[PDB]
Design a protein around this ligand. Structure first.
Ligand SMILES: CN1CCN(c2ncccc2F)CC1=O
Ligand SMILES: [Zn+2]
Ligand SMILES: [Zn+2]
Ligand SMILES: [Zn+2]
Length: 459
């Protein structure tokens, strides 16, 4: 019930063109042996090179699509393709590299995986659409053995070096030549009818097939991502903290209280329609406004049609007051809205590439977010930075260099000079806002929003 048993059956139909005459009855134990790996009954935390769908989902940050195409079987050169976009050519003697021997190819494989995964995961998961040559070629760049630790640190071992007989994690594997103890999963064992391209092209129109191994590796991991995260959503799975997850979420909550609290003071809306997370709370609990909630889970597939969220017959008058769409992804936002929308294009360790232009955002939980579409925001404008505070000016306590800013909306700045307390709070809030923007989130607001209306709240 925890791992994939080596005695589970492996459907070999998808392997009989590269491997003609392959037995119909086959288990993982025989398949691993067939690949050139003697497991020799080793109870050292590595029960099987292959894993379950649930284990692959728990370790999605490790997924690397892998495909091998025959450029002509120890006679023919192989094209090794990865979801990173790399194409290596191995000779037995998008990045498309020329034909080189296995000893140099295996060195580049360790470099590529270590640079790709060092800040993502403690392992690699080869996501396959197994036809034969990828499983047979693994003996040339993979060495297996008991679970281990890094020679330079305490992280688990993910690489091996024959030159120095030592093991290393993804950070200390410079010059290492073997992938040590990788994991893998064959998507073809999930019961797909038809080939990779047909199943991929059913959900994703963003990846095309140039017939190169990398294109297939991308389509494989994409289709695996769709199956596990787009159409199957398991928000119960927690994920390790691998970066600024805590500061990003703290920043978002701070920005959220700030933007909503200020909009309510500037335009004095009677009602706020909060559309999104069914578990969300009032971000501004002391606000005068009538707060109404609408439940809508994170749409993993496509953005919600505003016509299905509001219409079809709650105040029902969504045009009265302001709508708050905090991370609720809709096709076109109404003009009376405050919106936080995650930009799927952002380059970060928390954002993994998704399906159909979307992205898998892993921050405590995995959220496949649909593609960012700038046209969702035609009735709105980008929210400009500001810091508002109605709190008393009282230091209570962080050194000081006089703060002079137009965007620090406080009583002290109204009356001339900014005080030390609001000056610390301004720089802390500025850092949180910067944290939030860089983490790929974008803020938008109704066109009539003006920060000038906030000075009046000081009388
Ligand atoms: C749980 N886990 C997965 C991710 N992981 C790392 N992530 C980022 C940087 C360095 C790492 F070792 C290693 C680990 O212990
Ligand atoms: Zn290490
Ligand atoms: Zn795709
Ligand atoms: Zn002040």
């Amino acid at each position: 019930p925890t791992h994939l048993s080596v005695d589970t059956k492996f459907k070999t139909e998808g392997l009989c063109v590269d491997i003609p005459g392959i037995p119909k009855d086959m288990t993982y134990r025989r398949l691993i042996s067939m690949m050139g790996f003697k497991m020799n009954y080793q109870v050292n935390g590595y029960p099987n090179m292959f894993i379950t769908r649930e284990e692959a989902i728990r370790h999605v940050r490790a997924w690397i699509g892998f495909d091998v195409e025959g450029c002509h079987g120890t006679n023919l050169p192989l094209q090794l393709g990865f979801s990173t976009g790399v194409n290596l050519v191995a000779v037995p003697t998008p990045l498309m590299y020329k034909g080189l021997p296995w000893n140099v190819v295996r060195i580049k494989i360790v470099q590529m995986l270590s640079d790709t995964l060092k800040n993502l995961s403690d392992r690699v998961v080869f996501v396959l659409w197994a036809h034969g040559f990828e499983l047979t070629s693994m003996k040339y760049f993979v060495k297996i053995g008991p679970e281990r630790t890094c020679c330079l640190c305490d992280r688990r071992a993910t690489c091996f070096s024959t030159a120095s007989d030592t093991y290393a994690c993804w950070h200390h594997s410079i010059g290492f030549d073997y992938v040590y103890n990788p994991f893998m999963i064959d998507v073809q064992q999930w019961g797909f009818t038809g080939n990779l391209q047909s199943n991929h092209d059913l959900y994703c129109q963003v990846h095309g097939n140039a017939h190169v191994a990398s294109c297939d590796a991308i389509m494989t991991r994409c289709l695996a991502v769709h199956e596990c995260f787009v159409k199957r959503v398991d928000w119960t799975i927690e994920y390790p903290i691998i970066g600024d997850e805590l500061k990003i979420n703290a920043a978002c909550r701070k920005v959220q209280h700030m933007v909503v609290k200020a909009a309510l003071l500037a335009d004095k809306f009677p009602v706020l329609h909060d559309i999104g997370n069914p578990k969300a709370i009032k971000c501004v609990p002391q606000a005068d406004v009538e707060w109404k909630f609408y439940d809508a889970q994170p749409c993993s597939d496509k953005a919600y049609k505003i016509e299905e969220l509001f219409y079809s017959y709650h105040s029902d008058k969504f045009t009265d007051g302001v709508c708050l769409f905090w991370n609720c992804n809709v096709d076109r936002y109404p003009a009376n809205s405050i919106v936080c929308r995650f930009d799927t294009r952002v380059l970060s360790n928390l954002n993994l590439p998704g399906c159909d232009g979307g992205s898998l955002y892993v921050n405590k939980h995995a959220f496949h977010t649909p593609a960012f579409d700038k046209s969702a925001f035609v009735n709105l404008k980008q929210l400009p930075f500001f810091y508002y505070s109605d709190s008393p000016c009282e230091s209570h306590g962080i050194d000081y260099v006089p703060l002079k800013s137009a965007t620090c909306i406080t009583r002290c700045n109204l009356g001339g000079a900014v005080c030390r307390h609001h000056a610390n709070e301004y720089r802390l809030y500025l850092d949180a806002y910067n944290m939030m923007i860089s983490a790929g989130f974008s803020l938008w607001v109704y066109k009539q929003f003006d920060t000038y209306n906030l000075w009046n709240t000081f009388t």
